[PDB]
Symmetry: C3
């Protein structure tokens, strides 16, 4: 297996890999163009996002936006994200329809072994993140690697999501807990 295939599949990979280095530069180029583009530039922004992401249809994303690869982000219909959102997509980040991200939401997929020896060994690895339909994620929340958020979930601002979230609940806190059922 290619290092890219290993990375996407959530296995140990090498980021210094040639293809991956090139992929990150391509994404950086597109991100940079996205972020310095004007808001009146709809065709350009839409064109850049179609190029960047694995899947996208309607998407309103305020700069500044950031991702690592782009092709690991899969966004359902009518996606909305306020400024300073970060989607670090070492592994697939799959988001359903009608998602709303408030400002400064961070979604991570990269991780490291907790054991220091292993960590300092160059080991690189990620875990996918999946988010359902009609999910609202409040300002400055953090969604950790390997998390699955169900449909119709409201994530309060500043929440740090470390475990799966079932359908139809409001979560909040660090660590995030169920606040109430919808």
């Amino acid at each position: 297996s290619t290092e890219k295939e290993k990375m996407i599949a959530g296995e140990l990979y090498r980021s210094a890999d040639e293809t991956l280095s090139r992929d990150r530069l391509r994404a950086r180029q597109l991100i940079h163009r996205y972020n310095h583009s004007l808001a009146e530039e709809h065709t350009l922004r839409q064109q850049i996002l179609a190029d960047l992401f694995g899947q996208v249809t309607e998407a309103y994303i305020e700069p500044t936006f950031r991702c690592d690869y782009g092709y690991n982000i899969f966004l359902g219909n009518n996606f909305f994200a306020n400024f300073d959102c970060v989607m670090l997509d070492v592994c697939p980040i799959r988001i359903g329809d009608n998602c709303m991200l408030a400002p400064g939401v961070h979604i991570y997929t990269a991780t490291h072994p907790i054991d220091p020896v292993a960590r300092n060994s160059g080991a690189e690895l990620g875990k996918p993140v999946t988010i359902g339909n009609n999910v609202w994620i409040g300002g400055r929340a953090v969604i950790n690697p390997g998390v699955t958020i169900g449909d119709n979930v409201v994530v309060a601002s500043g929440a740090v999501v470390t475990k799966d979230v079932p359908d139809n609940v409001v979560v909040g806190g660090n660590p995030a807990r169920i606040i109430k059922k919808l």
Copy 2:
């Protein structure tokens, strides 16, 4: 009743109202000027803040700063904010005298219904935020919509404030709780 008066009053409003859209454009223009202002350009900075806010006297605000409208921000005397502070002022954000915001403090006022049908309906709404005199808000705190913070309050770094905070306490945590009486 114009959409603007509805917005400010904390009622359902339509952001696409032409007057509100002109208003956000003006704010972005002013914010952009502020953020790219060289350092010794203190006059320019002061004049921009006088033009942007609903009320301001002495105010030291390190770029980058961000707000939505500007005119819903009312700042008391001797206001101070470190870099990357954000005041999303769909509704009034009233802050008393001698306020100190550390870096990356976010104050929000916009909200959404928790019900997904209602949320996906295009319903736009906010709640005011009021902060007292002599309040010190630590790095990366989040102040949520509808919250009132009393006088002489210390908000610990990273705190996420979801409810009123009475006078003379230190609060911290997410959710933020009383840590000690002053």
Copy 3:
């Protein structure tokens, strides 16, 4: 004691002090140059950090990076920090070998008295931060003033650290608590 000596030693100091002011200005110049440097400007980035920090050997720091003075930052071998990290170094921030900071980690040393009269009095003070060897700090964590983090610690994303952390543990939450032993 020059105000500088007081600042560094964690005593009440006056920031408006000319050398300090010059020192902060110098730091801003270097940071600015670092932050706008293109990637392949290896030589330059490394040269700038050598000039900025009190101690550094191998350090990979993704822009944007930010500090107050630079000379209060002491970094051990093989230092790594992702983008948006902030080290506000009014007092010494001493970090061991093989440290890894995920994006948007904030380390603070400045503080203010909790008493309002004393706070509004112009009182300026800091507390040193010390971090051990082989520490991995997750995305958007906050390390507060006066904290000491032992060796082989993993600080979970979004954790807010307010008290010392002993060797060989994973901490997480706000406030951060021991999640498990390593």
